[PDB]
Symmetry: D2
């Protein structure tokens, strides 16, 4: 699994479950092409997005549909979505974990890049 | 000043100075139209991006050019930029502060929204 | 103003108003001696805690009473308080801003340290 | 495992390995009594701190020795340590994960409380 997404809810102190996540790759003409998507599990994780073969060097965008998540909880949030944009680079370690911590008017994201 | 951006550096414990910021607005055709840009000051603040008149209802994207910041400091960071996308002024005019706290492999952004 | 505290609320997108803050200094006997206290303003800021003369070198603990804040708002949060423990002024006087961003089950704190 | 600690490094984008963690319980006389301790693993996690039998309701303090961590990397940090103080409560879910994200002048902590 070269790319994993983990989402946490800072209001409830829980995984953020059933959050839609869309991954895009930047194409030559500077547009964003769909690449992978899924919904977080009961543990707030989304595995199996891509394969080592498919996940080549490039710029990627991970879009997390935070607005739907909060609205389903009856909370009006600030952001349309959370967006994580990064270059995948073969130099560094093999596995990318993109973590996000959600509040209604804030989010934090960190990358854990390991072998 | 209805839109302000403040950026801190979690490695140095300082304002993040000279951080480029580009703001876009979603147009009728659903493309991102350039709206305003600037750079943070010595206090890590960026004022004067827009006016109450021009900051109409819409979906805005605040791009904070974190890679250019870390690279200008000779550090290789993870993200290309921090993106903050939100609907503004859809219940009337508000004042928005977008705050961001930067590390090379992490950032945190929050909004402070007040009613004038 | 050598020690200031600023607190934001990540649920409301607002300053965190009326947050109690207690500051302690580690004494010669290694106990925490009360040093200064106050409450954040309508801007989420707390000024006037101490003076340059009284803010000598030492290990300080800034306790931000987050539970009392969330409970005063009728919310049941996770933490008792946010604690920020640091050595101050050991290379000469500095100005410290302790910022904190609060959610019911999470907080983030950063320091901005400047040289007057 | 009713109490797990996970520590991440926001400068390197990695688990924070070999970080000392001390857990204390608040005793009747308002002092902090040692309760459990350990060092984070290669995955930045510290398991096996306590047992369900031992982890009763009460106020606990998790002290993470961030200062030593940064100094071992040649970085001068701000905090003496990171401190997480909370009440354990039998009402809510069973398992506490205390997560911390470390930078030299900042840290963030969130609780993930699950069944
Ligand atoms: O000029 C003003 O009137 C006020 O501006 C504030 O600037 C900031 C600036 C900030 O930049 C932050 C932050 O950045 C965060 C923060 C902390 C952790 C995170 O994970 C995310 C955000 C909290 O409070 C803040 C305050 C000053 O602290 C305050 O003294 C001053 O009077
Ligand atoms: O089971 C899995 O497959 C994987 O679950 C993930 O667990 C977590 C769990 C977490 O709990 C966090 C966090 O909580 C923080 C965090 C803290 C404060 C912030 O402001 C932002 C992020 C970031 O990464 C994380 C990762 C890990 O990637 C991995 O150890 C585990 O095998």
């Amino acid at each position: 699994c070269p790319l994993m997404v983990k989402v946490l809810d800072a209001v409830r102190g829980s995984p953020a479950i059933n959050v839609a996540v869309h991954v895009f790759r930047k194409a030559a003409d500077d547009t964003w092409e769909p690449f992978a998507s899924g919904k977080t599990s009961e543990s707030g994780e989304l595995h199996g997005l891509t394969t080592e073969e498919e996940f080549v060097e490039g710029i990627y965008k991970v879009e997390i549909d935070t607005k739907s998540y909060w609205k389903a909880l009856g909370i009006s949030p600030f952001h349309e979505h959370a967006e994580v944009v990064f270059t995948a680079n073969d130099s560094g370690p093999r596995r990318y974990t993109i973590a996000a911590l959600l509040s209604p008017y804030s989010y934090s994201t960190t990358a854990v890049v390991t072998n």
